Write a protein that binds this ligand. Structure first.
Ligand SMILES: CC(C)c1cc(C(=O)NCc2ccc(F)cc2)[nH]n1
Length: 149
């Protein structure tokens, strides 16, 4: 799998993160990210993907060592952490054929795991519209604890 790059954008309070919702297969909510182009630097891919999906340019704010990276089914996904973006920032995707909506979400109210269906005696996880974000949420909370307190 080809690596993906993106960002976790937080507001000034550090309470809220920016998620985007796409269409069809990508119909839930997740962090803005996408597939690296051949010969493209990770920081550049992240800024480009985030710019296309939200209209907000993170290039002046990316810090090289501040990211969270997960390998999920042998695909690397790296999200650069970008704090302090004002909640009144007007976000507008370029790619409005790909992005339905863009919203702030409270970190503390997002799930950091999906629920089972053990109150139904059935194996698996119930659907959750935050499926793509979920795996970053515990690591983000642990990273904010360390970096801030
Ligand atoms: C595979 C299934 C579970 C899935 C994946 C996603 C998803 O990625 N949504 C967020 C998103 C959408 C468009 C975009 F350009 C960037 C991020 N939603 N459902």
């Amino acid at each position: 799998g080809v690596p993906t790059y993106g960002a976790i954008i937080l507001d000034e309070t550090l309470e809220n993160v920016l998620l985007v919702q796409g269409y069809l297969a990508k119909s839930g909510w997740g962090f803005p990210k996408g597939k690296v182009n051949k010969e493209e630097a990770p920081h550049d891919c992240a800024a480009r993907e985030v710019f296309e999906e939200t209209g907000f340019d993170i290039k002046d704010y990316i810090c090289k060592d501040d990211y969270i990276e997960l390998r999920i089914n042998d695909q690397l996904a790296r999200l650069y952490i970008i704090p302090g973006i004002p909640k009144d920032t007007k976000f507008n995707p370029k790619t409005r054929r790909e992005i339905r909506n863009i919203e702030w979400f409270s970190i503390e109210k997002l799930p950091c795991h999906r629920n089972d269906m053990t109150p139904k005696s059935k194996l698996g996880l119930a659907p959750n519209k935050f499926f793509m974000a979920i795996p970053f949420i515990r690591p983000l909370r642990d990273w904010l604890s360390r970096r801030f307190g």
